[PDB]
Amino acid sequence: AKMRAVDAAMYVLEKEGITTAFGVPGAAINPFYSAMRKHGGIRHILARHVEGASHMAEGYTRATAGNIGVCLGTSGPAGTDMITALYSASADSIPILCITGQAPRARLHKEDFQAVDIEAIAKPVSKMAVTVREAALVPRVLQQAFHLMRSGRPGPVLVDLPFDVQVAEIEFDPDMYEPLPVYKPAASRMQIEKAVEMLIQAERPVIVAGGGVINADAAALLQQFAELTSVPVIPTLMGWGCIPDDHELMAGMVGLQTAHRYGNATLLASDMVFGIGNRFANRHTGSVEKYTEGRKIVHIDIEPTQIGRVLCPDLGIVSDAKAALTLLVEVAQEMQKAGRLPCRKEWVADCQQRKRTLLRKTHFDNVPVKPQRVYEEMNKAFGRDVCYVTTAGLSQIAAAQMLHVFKDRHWINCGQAGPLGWTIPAALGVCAADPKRNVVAISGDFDFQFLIEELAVGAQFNIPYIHVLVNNAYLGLIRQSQRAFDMDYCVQLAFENINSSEVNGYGVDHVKVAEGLGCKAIRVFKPEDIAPAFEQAKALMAQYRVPVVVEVILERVTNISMGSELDNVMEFEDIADNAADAPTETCFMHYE
Amino acid sequence: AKMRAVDAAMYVLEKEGITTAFGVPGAAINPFYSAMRKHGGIRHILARHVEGASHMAEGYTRATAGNIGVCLGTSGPAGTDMITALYSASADSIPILCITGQAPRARLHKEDFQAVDIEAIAKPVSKMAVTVREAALVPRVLQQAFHLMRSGRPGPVLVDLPFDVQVAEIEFDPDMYEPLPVYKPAASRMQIEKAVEMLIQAERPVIVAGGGVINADAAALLQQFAELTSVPVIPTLMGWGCIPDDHELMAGMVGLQTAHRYGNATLLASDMVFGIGNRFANRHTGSVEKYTEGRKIVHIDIEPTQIGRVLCPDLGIVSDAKAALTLLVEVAQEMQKAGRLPCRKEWVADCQQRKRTLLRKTHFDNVPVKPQRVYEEMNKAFGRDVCYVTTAGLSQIAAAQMLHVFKDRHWINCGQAGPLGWTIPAALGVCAADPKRNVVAISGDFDFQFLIEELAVGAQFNIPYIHVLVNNAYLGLIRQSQRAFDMDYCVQLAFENINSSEVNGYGVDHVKVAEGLGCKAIRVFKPEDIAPAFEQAKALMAQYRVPVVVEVILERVTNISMGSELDNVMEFEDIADNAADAPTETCFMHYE
Amino acid sequence: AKMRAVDAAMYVLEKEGITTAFGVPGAAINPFYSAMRKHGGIRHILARHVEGASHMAEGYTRATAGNIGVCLGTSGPAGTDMITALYSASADSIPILCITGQAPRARLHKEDFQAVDIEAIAKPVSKMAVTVREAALVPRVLQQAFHLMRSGRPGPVLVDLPFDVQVAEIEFDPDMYEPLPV
Ligand SMILES: Cc1cc2nc3c(=O)[nH]c(=O)nc-3n(C[C@H](O)[C@H](O)[C@H](O)COP(=O)(O)OP(=O)(O)OC[C@H]3O[C@@H](n4cnc5c(N)ncnc54)[C@H](O)[C@@H]3O)c2cc1C
Ligand SMILES: Cc1cc2nc3c(=O)[nH]c(=O)nc-3n(C[C@H](O)[C@H](O)[C@H](O)COP(=O)(O)OP(=O)(O)OC[C@H]3O[C@@H](n4cnc5c(N)ncnc54)[C@H](O)[C@@H]3O)c2cc1C
Ligand SMILES: COP(=O)(O)[C@](C)(O)c1sc(CCOP(=O)(O)OP(=O)(O)O)c(C)[n+]1Cc1cnc(C)nc1N
Ligand SMILES: COP(=O)(O)[C@](C)(O)c1sc(CCOP(=O)(O)OP(=O)(O)O)c(C)[n+]1Cc1cnc(C)nc1N
Ligand SMILES: *C1=C(C)C(=O)C(OC)=C(OC)C1=O
Ligand SMILES: *C1=C(C)C(=O)C(OC)=C(OC)C1=O
Ligand SMILES: COP(=O)(O)C(C)=O
Ligand SMILES: COP(=O)(O)C(C)=O
Ligand SMILES: [Mg+2]
Ligand SMILES: [Mg+2]
Ligand SMILES: [Mg+2]
Ligand SMILES: [Mg+2]
Ligand SMILES: [Mg+2]
Ligand SMILES: [Mg+2]
Ligand code: NA
Ligand code: NA
Ligand code: NA
Ligand code: NA
């Protein structure tokens, strides 16, 4: 019967499916740590920055449907160090549960050491942020937290626990605890029949499959619906993987940066966008006037106030993507049996022809190394089960342009917020979620430096993955954005390293740093040494069971393809219309 | 006449005295960077984490009276990464100016890439947080920002700049720009005369000199007033340095952790606390009932709502500490000339006797090294002009117990928030403020890891200082706090480093990491090698002009003295009553 | 197909079962009153204090299970005059729907006559308080409002409508509108 509030909390977490937490203890959260030790059901991973714990939790969530990453911390600056992750999780409609210690209730207005109003700070980037005011409410707040994290548009929750609230005794019967029901609206048959009637009337439709499809665990249904209707599929960056890149209907990605020449050309040639669990992000659309010109728009979203937010759909449907796709498949089957689905061989052929011809060169023998070549080598070295984790920079943009993925939740990327430092901890979090996953991270040098210390978490806990580090001794994306201002200013990271003449003025020696943090590292200067470096990295991983960093020394300056509209993406580097120049496109290469 | 809003902003910053900024550019803040380049008056230092830039700005502010550290960043996660510094600056009543880029005004409700409501997030930890809605307001918001940062209780400001607002042209005449007046209330003669009458009637008074004395640039007046009245001075942690540690009236520090046995004993023996620019923090007082028992309390504070917040003073006076101390000196001089100031030889003698006898041992020859010995060696190796920078941990607590400082702004410490990672960037910020300052940082291993990458900022920009790193492969303070829970759980950082058997299972190899980041580093295992390591560090600094890390390998477990009340501080390690055991107390050693 | 956002709002209110509103018009909410007149399905009762309209809405809700009283007002002080009712409705776990007119979007930070941040004021005493920033979202915000007023612990909602948002044309098919599940 009688236990501390925090002891009750462990029973709640266990019943809600939690088996892992990432965190940094402190005096104010010690009662919770005490409870976690006595209960024994949760594996704790000690981060080397509270921000690191917060992004580990994000990776854990993103790795596997139903996962909820947990981030623990003390009072005061621990909560403030979780805001960037709450923002990133909110921004991408995924949940993490942050739990912070706090000063005792009676001391909250008294400027106690490390007492901050985390409720007010976190409110704008959470579905709920609450300082729990009574011991008996601790289980109830967690119970509601799980309901909110799973329901509607998913998002994160912060629970703030005054010390005295944590340690007070309550009566709690674990056998009587039950998770709450999850709220998800479902499209009616009438909605879905109208959508399919509209699709049947389009001559050149595409499905734009967003992150909501993955959130809903509906990848197989999305592919089934596309196959039944013979409609090309353009994943958003957040939908990437919900149909394999080598599927005959996968028509590429669209947008201003993380996009294909063939994807943009297909979108602009289409007469309908059938949007499922997407939200028409500005870096996907450019100007919405241009994106929607001559096109009917269908938009299916779980969140009513996402529909009409940035563009007006011809038909907007409020629905969970799995519920919607179940009915879309069933209606499509009825239409097929009635002979009412049109044959789309010519439009599909046209999309595949663009995908065959409108390429970018990757096969460069240049020294110093061209980044494009790294992505080619990654495609060749890893299997189709590879799981990529990345953030933002020319590193990530060119990666999204040139790598291939074949499974949902095998592109793990903070698409809306892009906080530098996210990559290392997020990757560790994916690995903790799934120790059999083949995780390969991609970072530029600056991203890799923000939370570089988190490599030692991988060393201490023996969490193996391969980290690809593409080093230009620059904030490369920011250099490129500064061309509009005719400058290159405060974006260089180069210096003569007094301990390493072998980095040739590139500044930080990432091999020495990674090795100091307990990991393994290989530096590559020549494009023909990339493939053997990847093979060696796999061997070192197997042998030592720690992260292995493969650092490629790039040319300082490479302008990656991008523009302000779909029809305006500038190609600075060589394009390609043949496989020899772009040999790892799925049309030319069998993956696995 | 006609220039961009951001060009006007550079003229405002110049006229407001800004010469330095710390930051990380991004597309949304590039117009401001463009303006900064064209204008040329501000030295920019590129951080390797936005959080790093934010704490550099804090160090810069703290180094020298009138300084205002500037932190620049892009939209979205850059602002969220500045919250911990806004909190820390607010918490300690010091200003930083954060400036963030933002999405264009028309796009603010549209989930543009990296658009976040930073105004709402930062409001709780700033004097003003504002998204500027018109180009013409940019100079006016900055003008008001400087007024608020300097006025009343100081604190930080965040200015958020939509891209379109930055680039729009306004008409601005730099010659017509004038900073606003600064609001500071001043005590009346009637207030100060009552305070001095009350002081004259005390038999055993102490002055508690807080951070407000330093904030007001009033250290010399504080010492003058103490000398005229012959009243012992107890600095708060945030007041430390406002009278030299070797002054005959400096009676030690008080509290639960960063405090002296003699300080606590003096406070408990006193019959009056004369508080000037302090606020009676809970780690200074313990229970206020015990702190105020048998004592009259005077409290002078610039902020009305600080007076009576945690304890009821017998006399509370709203005043700037410099204004107050000017009048306190003048009234004390009148009282002296009238023969009305009592002679306090016996009480002063009693305070000095406690300071002579109630010590803690530092002189340990143990291997592995006892942390206490490190502080002894630091006192001997550095001059009286040393400037210490630190955060929190057993590292910082024992430092505050055992190091000595002789000048105001030579203890630079985030006393109220204690965010791990603060030390490295804050130190770099102090160095940037004053290139002739002799900066010595103190970190535990965990603190040192949070923002370890910032060492490469020191390497790239050639910013020299000495960083003392006391390594126990533990969150030592948290281990010690967990004794109350009979556990040692999730607080160890040790592992067998696969690249360094010479760290003997301590985990991270800080010498390899520091050297990889472009700095110099020396590891010490034996107490007699500390002094020569400090001499070598000075030589390497002079030669290479980069940070030099001196890592001392400590015993894993040392319980530092601390308790829950002034009369309850537990001494786990050996105390001392003689100089041989504690040879660097000012009574026994001449500093410089 | 094409009608003003406020015309779409009338169809949403009809489909959500509204037949009655209590209110006080003003210039900023006149487009909504215009739409209510054209549509014809709602009996308006004109109060002699906005506070009076707001407590009429409360009484209407409380009278009969499923009822949701609607309170209409202009910008500025009309919304501030509804705060007491929002508080009372919240406090007793019952819904009212308050609709306020508002200055045009481009004028929201410009101290326009009677422009107030009613979103911030009403947030503490409502399940949702929102200034609608696009015409196409007007029907979706109302759709979400009815879900929130009926679901979980019931409580009130305030919807604040910039003038330009009210009058802008959108595509809206009344036949395809369905209330959300509770
Ligand atoms: C440097 C950089 C460049 C980029 N360039 C591009 C680019 O060129 N092209 C591009 O497309 N992206 C790009 N992105 C990513 C971009 O910012 C967005 O993150 C992305 O386009 C949004 O994907 P989405 O529309 O699928 O939205 P998501 O953020 O995945 O959300 C879509 C919708 O899912 C809904 N939802 C949630 N759960 C469910 C459910 N169960 N059922 C149904 N709906 C649900 C939500 O309500 C939401 O409205 C880039 C990112 C970076 C960092
Ligand atoms: C692990 C750890 C242990 C600690 N242990 C102790 C301890 O044992 N003892 C201890 O004392 N501290 C300790 N501290 C520090 C403690 O938390 C507080 O930061 C500190 O005691 C507050 O100092 P203060 O009262 O001078 O306040 P400050 O934060 O310096 O502010 C005092 C007042 O100055 C006022 N003010 C600002 N400008 C002016 C001006 N111009 N004129 C007049 N007033 C002005 C403000 O309004 C404020 O009320 C510890 C910190 C840490 C991290
Ligand atoms: C009194 O306990 P606390 O308030 O819990 C405190 C002082 O605040 C500290 S100190 C500390 C550990 C410091 O470890 P170090 O190796 O740096 O120091 P040490 O081993 O103690 O000499 C931690 C994790 N925290 C907690 C902490 C956690 N996360 C952040 C961001 N900042 C913190 N500062
Ligand atoms: C389109 O520009 P942006 O939005 O400004 C963007 C994508 O967001 C980026 S990417 C970037 C530089 C990345 O440098 P890397 O060396 O990691 O990569 P690269 O050199 O481009 O291959 C910076 C500083 N920021 C800005 C940035 C700054 N601070 C934080 C915390 N996160 C950021 N992500
Ligand atoms: C290349 C492309 C681009 C195709 O679309 C295709 O059909 C799916 C191929 O054959 C399978 C191909 O090799
Ligand atoms: C030791 C102590 C503690 C004193 O107080 C003192 O007087 C100021 C000394 O002599 C100067 C001393 O050496
Ligand atoms: C940090 O800015 P920099 O001085 O590095 C430049 C002038 O490019
Ligand atoms: C992170 O927690 P640990 O597993 O390290 C422990 C059991 O002490
Ligand atoms: Mg894959
Ligand atoms: Mg780079
Ligand atoms: Mg000194
Ligand atoms: Mg870091
Ligand atoms: Mg330690
Ligand atoms: Mg106006
Ligand atoms: Na492959
Ligand atoms: Na000295
Ligand atoms: Na009223
Ligand atoms: Na609310």
UniProtKB/Swiss-Prot annotation, chains A, B:
It holds the Pfam family TPP_enzyme_N. It catalyses: 2 glyoxylate + H(+) = 2-hydroxy-3-oxopropanoate + CO2. Binds 1 Mg(2+) ion per subunit. Binds 1 thiamine pyrophosphate per subunit. One of its GO terms (biological process) is isoleucine biosynthetic process. Keywords: Lyase, Magnesium, Thiamine pyrophosphate. One of its GO terms (cellular component) is acetolactate synthase complex. It is an enzyme of class 4 (lyase). Induction: By glyoxylate. InterPro entries: DHS-like_NAD/FAD-binding_dom (IPR029035), Gcl_TPP-bd (IPR047034), Glyox_carbo_lig (IPR006397), THDP-binding (IPR029061), Thiamin_PyroP_enz_cen_dom (IPR012000), Thiamin_PyroP_enz_TPP-bd_dom (IPR012001), TPP_enz (IPR045229), TPP_enzyme_TPP-bd (IPR011766). Its cofactor is Mg(2+); thiamine diphosphate. Gene3D superfamilies: 3.40.50.970, TPP-binding domain. Pathway: Organic acid metabolism; glycolate degradation; 3-phospho-D-glycerate from glycolate: step 2/4. Its EC number is 4.1.1.47. It comes from the Bacteria. GO terms for molecular function: FAD binding; flavin adenine dinucleotide binding; identical protein binding; magnesium ion binding; tartronate-semialdehyde synthase activity; thiamine pyrophosphate binding. Catalyzes the condensation of two molecules of glyoxylate to give 2-hydroxy-3-oxopropanoate (also termed tartronate semialdehyde). Belongs to the TPP enzyme family. Homotetramer. This is Glyoxylate carboligase. The gene is gcl.
